[PDB]
Enzyme design. Structure first.
Site, PDB file in Angstrom:
ATOM      1  N   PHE A  27       0.824  -1.205   0.000  1.00 35.84           N
ATOM      2  CA  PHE A  27       0.000   0.000   0.000  1.00 35.84           C
ATOM      3  C   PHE A  27       0.860   1.258   0.000  1.00 35.84           C
ATOM      4  O   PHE A  27       0.505   2.256  -0.636  1.00 35.84           O
ATOM      5  N   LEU A  30       2.145   1.542  -3.490  1.00 38.45           N
ATOM      6  CA  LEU A  30       1.062   1.998  -4.352  1.00 38.45           C
ATOM      7  C   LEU A  30       0.814   3.490  -4.175  1.00 38.45           C
ATOM      8  O   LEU A  30       0.602   4.211  -5.156  1.00 38.45           O
ATOM      9  N   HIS A  31       0.846   3.973  -2.929  1.00 38.41           N
ATOM     10  CA  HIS A  31       0.720   5.404  -2.669  1.00 38.41           C
ATOM     11  C   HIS A  31       1.902   6.196  -3.216  1.00 38.41           C
ATOM     12  O   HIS A  31       1.758   7.392  -3.493  1.00 38.41           O
ATOM     13  N   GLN A  32       3.059   5.558  -3.375  1.00 37.35           N
ATOM     14  CA  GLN A  32       4.197   6.213  -4.005  1.00 37.35           C
ATOM     15  C   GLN A  32       4.128   6.192  -5.531  1.00 37.35           C
ATOM     16  O   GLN A  32       4.503   7.180  -6.173  1.00 37.35           O
TER      17      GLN A  32
END
EC number: 3.1.-.-
Lengths: 189, 293
Positions: A27, A30-32
């Site tokens: 996660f 993914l946020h990066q």
């Protein structure tokens, strides 16, 4: 589609936790680059889930764009998860291919928010809440989820999924806007 | 020549509890009197606190010493079995020292494996270590756990220096007392993590803390010797030891990766096993614990 190179980033192992810590590291990645990196088809799926219990996955067969798959190759914000996380390299692919899609998108499967709206607006009584508030309040099924860390509950949590049926045709699109899929690439072959 | 009844082996590398306090970014040169973590409540009852909206670096504060003296069982009965055990331990002491075990414990003290969930979230996991024989500093150390890997056995020059000083404390002729101060940059308004009782949290006098047995099992994370799939690396070391959050049994009794077959062949039959199996034997004899049925 005139290109035969579509990959992704799978989950990385570590001994300091169960796979919920790997789900939190995925996660963060993914946020990066994938979920919080904008775009539609930026998510993390897996074809290692059974349809009888909504499993999460046991391998990594990604399918996404090139920038989101090439930004998590030498970045320095994956310490620890990069102690086991790795990958191979790109190559050519076959000429023909189908367009199959399976992923998990953000759906409305919680009876708390609608009940809170019906308590702030309707103000239901006992028999009125038992009769007008119907028996469709237990809204939850077995879906694919991992231990997501966040300040919405105390400990880690779960989550559901939802996708569509595909065929052997040709098409392309995007996934949900939270780090999931809605017809994107999943593990198949 | 048979087994003794009750075998007592006390816990060497005996740890203590891990306090928590919160400081800010670029205000951390005076990490001595930071405000601690108080127990808050929000609405079972989830009485789990958060860091304040200004301070973000969680100073995790705990110490450690080494008792030493693993050549004598703390409880035994026999005379000839004890003489065999004493001459076998003396054979190891004349064979090789505590360098390998000190460097593996440095690998434990190089990454942030002792923080089980607190590692994720932090930005620059800095390990501040002083040297204590009395109430002052004698030598200092600064680490970073993002330039230092998690699974890979690597021993840098600074890690070799600290492991050599720990081994000088370990050999049984010199006493060392080294603490660990870590910085978990959890954030401004994000969760604190004490240990959980049987929510059922843990706390101390006007502060919050984390239990000591979790540190004592985290720092002995050595086990890369389970035959199924070693792509996960080091796990916890016990006889019949494994990880209990996955649900899978490691160091099977069907193979010869058990401590008990090694002890029986290594003491009774004089069928002495190899060096790394003796490293496992002395690792789970230096963790402490009960032995004997």
């Amino acid at each position: 589609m005139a290109m035969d190179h579509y990959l992704d980033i799978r989950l990385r192992p570590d001994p300091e936790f169960p796979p919920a810590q790997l789900m939190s590291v995925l996660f963060g990645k993914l946020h990066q680059a994938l979920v919080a990196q904008g775009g539609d088809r930026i998510g993390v799926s897996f074809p290692d889930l059974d349809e009888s219990r909504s499993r999460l996955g046991e391998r990594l067969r990604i399918h996404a764009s090139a920038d989101d798959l090439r930004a998590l190759l030498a970045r320095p914000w994956l310490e620890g998860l990069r102690d086991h996380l790795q990958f191979g390299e790109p190559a050519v692919v076959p000429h023909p291919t189908p367009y199959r899609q399976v992923s998990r998108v953000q759906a409305k499967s919680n009876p708390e928010r609608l009940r809170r709206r019906l308590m702030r607006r309707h103000d239901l009584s006992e028999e009125e809440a038992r009769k007008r508030i119907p028996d469709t309040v237990a809204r939850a099924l077995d879906l694919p989820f991992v231990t997501l860390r966040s300040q919405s509950t105390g400990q880690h949590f779960r989550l559901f999924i939802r996708h569509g049926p595909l065929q052997v045709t040709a098409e392309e699109g995007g996934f949900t806007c939270y780090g999931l899929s809605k017809g994107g690439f999943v593990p198949w072959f | 020549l048979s087994t003794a009844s009750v075998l007592a082996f006390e816990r060497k590398l005996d740890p203590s509890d891990a306090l928590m306090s919160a400081g800010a970014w670029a205000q951390r040169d005076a990490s001595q009197e930071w405000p601690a973590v108080t127990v808050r409540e929000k609405s079972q009852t989830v009485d789990v606190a958060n860091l304040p909206s200004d301070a973000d670096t969680l100073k995790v504060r705990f110490t450690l010493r080494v008792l030493g003296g693993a050549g004598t069982p703390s409880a035994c009965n026999d005379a000839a079995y004890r003489d065999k055990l004493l001459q076998t331990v003396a054979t190891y002491v004349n064979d090789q020292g505590f360098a390998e075990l000190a460097r593996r414990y440095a690998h434990n003290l190089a990454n942030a494996r002792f923080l089980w969930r607190n590692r994720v979230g932090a930005e620059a996991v800095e390990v501040r270590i002083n040297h204590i024989r009395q109430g002052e500093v004698a030598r200092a150390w600064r680490f970073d756990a993002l330039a230092i890997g998690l699974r890979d056995f690597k021993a840098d020059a600074e890690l070799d220096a600290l492991a050599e000083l720990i081994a000088s404390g370990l050999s049984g002729s010199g006493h060392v007392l080294l603490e660990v101060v870590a910085f978990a940059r959890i954030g401004d308004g994000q969760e604190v993590f004490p240990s959980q009782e049987l929510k059922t949290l843990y706390s101390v006098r006007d502060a919050a803390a984390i239990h000591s047995q979790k540190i004592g099992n985290a720092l002995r994370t050595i086990d890369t010797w389970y035959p199924d799939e070693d792509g996960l690396g080091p796990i916890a070391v016990e006889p019949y030891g494994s990880v209990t959050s996955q649900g899978k049994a490691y160091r099977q009794p069907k193979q010869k990766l058990d401590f008990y077959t090694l002890l029986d062949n290594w003491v009774l039959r004089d069928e002495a096993p190899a060096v790394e199996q003796q490293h496992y034997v002395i690792a789970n004899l230096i963790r402490g614990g009960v032995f004997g049925e």
